[PDB]
Amino acid sequence: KRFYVKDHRNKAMINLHIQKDNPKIVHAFDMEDLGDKAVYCRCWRSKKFPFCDGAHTKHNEETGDNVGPLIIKK
Amino acid sequence: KRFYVKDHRNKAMINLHIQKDNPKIVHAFDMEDLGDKAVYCRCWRSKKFPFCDGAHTKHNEETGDNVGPLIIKK
Ligand code: FES
Ligand code: FES
Known part of the structure:
Protein backbone atom coordinates (compact mmCIF):
# COMPACT_ATOMS: atom_id res chain seq x y z
CA LYS A 1 0.00 0.00 0.00
CA ARG A 2 2.96 1.99 0.90
CA PHE A 3 4.02 -0.28 -2.04
CA TYR A 4 1.60 1.16 -4.64
CA VAL A 5 2.47 3.85 -7.14
CA LYS A 6 -0.66 6.00 -7.44
CA ARG A 45 10.02 -4.27 -30.15
CA SER A 46 10.11 -5.98 -33.55
CA LYS A 47 13.54 -6.53 -35.07
CA LYS A 48 11.80 -6.20 -38.44
CA PHE A 49 10.01 -3.02 -37.51
CA PRO A 50 7.70 -1.68 -38.96
CA PHE A 51 6.61 -5.34 -39.47
CA CYS A 52 5.50 -7.57 -36.56
CA ASP A 53 7.86 -10.45 -35.67
CA GLY A 54 6.02 -11.76 -32.55
CA ALA A 55 8.09 -9.70 -30.12
CA HIS A 56 4.86 -8.29 -28.70
CA THR A 57 4.39 -11.68 -26.94
CA LYS A 58 7.50 -11.02 -24.76
CA HIS A 59 6.49 -7.40 -24.08
CA ASN A 60 3.02 -8.44 -22.97
CA GLU A 61 4.19 -11.23 -20.67
CA GLU A 62 6.98 -9.12 -19.15
CA THR A 63 4.97 -5.93 -18.56
CA GLY A 64 1.41 -7.31 -18.28
CA ASP A 65 0.30 -5.23 -21.26
CA ASN A 66 -2.09 -6.32 -24.10
CA VAL A 67 -0.84 -4.83 -27.31
CA GLY A 68 -0.63 -6.49 -30.71
CA PRO A 69 -0.23 -5.72 -34.40
CA LEU A 70 -2.23 -4.14 -37.21
CA ILE A 71 -3.10 -6.38 -40.25
CA ILE A 72 -3.83 -4.91 -43.72
CA LYS A 73 -4.82 -7.68 -46.17
CA LYS A 74 -6.55 -8.67 -49.47
CA LYS B 1 24.90 9.72 -11.15
CA ARG B 2 23.50 8.32 -8.05
CA PHE B 3 20.54 9.87 -9.98
CA TYR B 4 20.74 7.60 -13.05
CA VAL B 5 18.70 4.46 -13.57
CA LYS B 6 21.02 2.01 -15.33
CA ARG B 45 -3.00 7.28 -26.75
CA SER B 46 -5.50 8.09 -29.52
CA LYS B 47 -9.10 8.57 -28.44
CA LYS B 48 -10.02 7.24 -31.89
CA PHE B 49 -7.77 4.24 -31.63
CA PRO B 50 -6.89 2.36 -33.85
CA PHE B 51 -6.78 5.65 -35.85
CA CYS B 52 -4.24 8.42 -35.10
CA ASP B 53 -5.67 11.65 -33.62
CA GLY B 54 -2.36 13.50 -32.98
CA ALA B 55 -2.08 12.33 -29.38
CA HIS B 56 1.40 11.02 -30.17
CA THR B 57 2.58 14.67 -30.10
CA LYS B 58 1.79 14.88 -26.33
CA HIS B 59 3.35 11.47 -25.62
CA ASN B 60 6.56 12.40 -27.41
CA GLU B 61 6.94 15.78 -25.71
CA GLU B 62 6.10 14.40 -22.25
CA THR B 63 8.30 11.28 -22.38
CA GLY B 64 10.98 12.34 -24.89
CA ASP B 65 10.02 9.48 -27.21
CA ASN B 66 9.79 9.59 -31.07
CA VAL B 67 6.88 7.47 -32.13
CA GLY B 68 4.30 8.24 -34.79
CA PRO B 69 1.62 6.62 -36.93
CA LEU B 70 1.39 4.20 -39.84
CA ILE B 71 -0.22 5.51 -43.13
CA ILE B 72 -1.84 3.16 -45.67
CA LYS B 73 -3.01 5.11 -48.76
CA LYS B 74 -4.02 5.08 -52.47
S1 FES C 1 6.27 -7.31 -32.78
FE1 FES C 1 5.31 -5.53 -32.28
S2 FES C 1 3.12 -5.91 -32.51
FE2 FES C 1 4.11 -7.79 -33.01
S1 FES D 1 -2.27 9.18 -31.87
FE1 FES D 1 -1.05 7.50 -31.70
S2 FES D 1 0.38 7.60 -33.42
FE2 FES D 1 -0.87 9.38 -33.58
Whole structure:
Protein backbone atom coordinates (compact mmCIF):
# COMPACT_ATOMS: atom_id res chain seq x y z
CA LYS A 1 0.00 0.00 0.00
CA ARG A 2 2.96 1.99 0.90
CA PHE A 3 4.02 -0.28 -2.04
CA TYR A 4 1.60 1.16 -4.64
CA VAL A 5 2.47 3.85 -7.14
CA LYS A 6 -0.66 6.00 -7.44
CA ASP A 7 -2.37 6.87 -10.71
CA HIS A 8 -0.19 9.30 -12.59
CA ARG A 9 0.50 10.77 -16.00
CA ASN A 10 2.83 8.45 -17.90
CA LYS A 11 6.53 9.30 -18.12
CA ALA A 12 7.84 6.01 -19.81
CA MET A 13 8.88 5.82 -23.47
CA ILE A 14 7.10 3.26 -25.76
CA ASN A 15 10.00 3.03 -28.28
CA LEU A 16 13.35 2.34 -26.61
CA HIS A 17 15.80 1.73 -29.46
CA ILE A 18 14.29 2.08 -32.96
CA GLN A 19 15.67 4.87 -35.21
CA LYS A 20 16.26 7.24 -32.36
CA ASP A 21 17.89 9.94 -34.65
CA ASN A 22 14.45 10.38 -36.25
CA PRO A 23 12.44 12.67 -34.07
CA LYS A 24 9.01 11.16 -35.07
CA ILE A 25 8.93 7.71 -36.73
CA VAL A 26 6.16 7.68 -39.43
CA HIS A 27 5.72 5.01 -42.10
CA ALA A 28 3.55 5.35 -45.20
CA PHE A 29 2.79 2.58 -47.68
CA ASP A 30 0.70 2.47 -50.85
CA MET A 31 -1.84 -0.29 -50.78
CA GLU A 32 -1.07 -1.22 -54.44
CA ASP A 33 2.49 -2.12 -53.38
CA LEU A 34 1.28 -4.24 -50.52
CA GLY A 35 0.95 -7.92 -51.25
CA ASP A 36 -1.84 -10.07 -49.97
CA LYS A 37 -1.13 -9.30 -46.30
CA ALA A 38 1.07 -7.02 -44.15
CA VAL A 39 1.38 -7.41 -40.33
CA TYR A 40 2.63 -4.09 -38.79
CA CYS A 41 4.24 -3.79 -35.39
CA ARG A 42 2.45 -1.54 -32.75
CA CYS A 43 4.72 -2.43 -29.93
CA TRP A 44 8.14 -1.01 -31.08
CA ARG A 45 10.02 -4.27 -30.15
CA SER A 46 10.11 -5.98 -33.55
CA LYS A 47 13.54 -6.53 -35.07
CA LYS A 48 11.80 -6.20 -38.44
CA PHE A 49 10.01 -3.02 -37.51
CA PRO A 50 7.70 -1.68 -38.96
CA PHE A 51 6.61 -5.34 -39.47
CA CYS A 52 5.50 -7.57 -36.56
CA ASP A 53 7.86 -10.45 -35.67
CA GLY A 54 6.02 -11.76 -32.55
CA ALA A 55 8.09 -9.70 -30.12
CA HIS A 56 4.86 -8.29 -28.70
CA THR A 57 4.39 -11.68 -26.94
CA LYS A 58 7.50 -11.02 -24.76
CA HIS A 59 6.49 -7.40 -24.08
CA ASN A 60 3.02 -8.44 -22.97
CA GLU A 61 4.19 -11.23 -20.67
CA GLU A 62 6.98 -9.12 -19.15
CA THR A 63 4.97 -5.93 -18.56
CA GLY A 64 1.41 -7.31 -18.28
CA ASP A 65 0.30 -5.23 -21.26
CA ASN A 66 -2.09 -6.32 -24.10
CA VAL A 67 -0.84 -4.83 -27.31
CA GLY A 68 -0.63 -6.49 -30.71
CA PRO A 69 -0.23 -5.72 -34.40
CA LEU A 70 -2.23 -4.14 -37.21
CA ILE A 71 -3.10 -6.38 -40.25
CA ILE A 72 -3.83 -4.91 -43.72
CA LYS A 73 -4.82 -7.68 -46.17
CA LYS A 74 -6.55 -8.67 -49.47
CA LYS B 1 24.90 9.72 -11.15
CA ARG B 2 23.50 8.32 -8.05
CA PHE B 3 20.54 9.87 -9.98
CA TYR B 4 20.74 7.60 -13.05
CA VAL B 5 18.70 4.46 -13.57
CA LYS B 6 21.02 2.01 -15.33
CA ASP B 7 20.19 0.19 -18.55
CA HIS B 8 17.56 -2.41 -17.81
CA ARG B 9 14.93 -4.60 -19.38
CA ASN B 10 11.71 -2.62 -19.74
CA LYS B 11 8.92 -3.13 -17.23
CA ALA B 12 6.50 -0.25 -18.37
CA MET B 13 3.27 -0.89 -20.30
CA ILE B 14 2.81 0.84 -23.73
CA ASN B 15 -1.03 0.72 -23.63
CA LEU B 16 -2.46 2.12 -20.40
CA HIS B 17 -6.24 2.24 -20.93
CA ILE B 18 -7.41 0.88 -24.31
CA GLN B 19 -9.65 -2.23 -24.28
CA LYS B 20 -7.96 -3.75 -21.28
CA ASP B 21 -10.43 -6.77 -21.14
CA ASN B 22 -8.90 -7.92 -24.45
CA PRO B 23 -5.75 -9.78 -23.68
CA LYS B 24 -4.02 -8.91 -27.04
CA ILE B 25 -5.40 -6.01 -29.12
CA VAL B 26 -5.15 -6.93 -32.87
CA HIS B 27 -6.87 -5.06 -35.71
CA ALA B 28 -7.29 -6.37 -39.25
CA PHE B 29 -8.65 -4.40 -42.19
CA ASP B 30 -9.22 -5.29 -45.84
CA MET B 31 -7.55 -2.86 -48.17
CA GLU B 32 -10.65 -2.81 -50.46
CA ASP B 33 -12.67 -1.33 -47.57
CA LEU B 34 -10.09 1.31 -46.89
CA GLY B 35 -10.68 4.64 -48.54
CA ASP B 36 -7.98 6.76 -50.04
CA LYS B 37 -5.98 7.00 -46.80
CA ALA B 38 -5.96 5.55 -43.25
CA VAL B 39 -3.68 6.92 -40.46
CA TYR B 40 -3.26 4.23 -37.71
CA CYS B 41 -2.16 4.95 -34.17
CA ARG B 42 1.14 3.27 -32.94
CA CYS B 43 1.25 5.04 -29.67
CA TRP B 44 -1.91 3.73 -27.85
CA ARG B 45 -3.00 7.28 -26.75
CA SER B 46 -5.50 8.09 -29.52
CA LYS B 47 -9.10 8.57 -28.44
CA LYS B 48 -10.02 7.24 -31.89
CA PHE B 49 -7.77 4.24 -31.63
CA PRO B 50 -6.89 2.36 -33.85
CA PHE B 51 -6.78 5.65 -35.85
CA CYS B 52 -4.24 8.42 -35.10
CA ASP B 53 -5.67 11.65 -33.62
CA GLY B 54 -2.36 13.50 -32.98
CA ALA B 55 -2.08 12.33 -29.38
CA HIS B 56 1.40 11.02 -30.17
CA THR B 57 2.58 14.67 -30.10
CA LYS B 58 1.79 14.88 -26.33
CA HIS B 59 3.35 11.47 -25.62
CA ASN B 60 6.56 12.40 -27.41
CA GLU B 61 6.94 15.78 -25.71
CA GLU B 62 6.10 14.40 -22.25
CA THR B 63 8.30 11.28 -22.38
CA GLY B 64 10.98 12.34 -24.89
CA ASP B 65 10.02 9.48 -27.21
CA ASN B 66 9.79 9.59 -31.07
CA VAL B 67 6.88 7.47 -32.13
CA GLY B 68 4.30 8.24 -34.79
CA PRO B 69 1.62 6.62 -36.93
CA LEU B 70 1.39 4.20 -39.84
CA ILE B 71 -0.22 5.51 -43.13
CA ILE B 72 -1.84 3.16 -45.67
CA LYS B 73 -3.01 5.11 -48.76
CA LYS B 74 -4.02 5.08 -52.47
S1 FES C 1 6.27 -7.31 -32.78
FE1 FES C 1 5.31 -5.53 -32.28
S2 FES C 1 3.12 -5.91 -32.51
FE2 FES C 1 4.11 -7.79 -33.01
S1 FES D 1 -2.27 9.18 -31.87
FE1 FES D 1 -1.05 7.50 -31.70
S2 FES D 1 0.38 7.60 -33.42
FE2 FES D 1 -0.87 9.38 -33.58
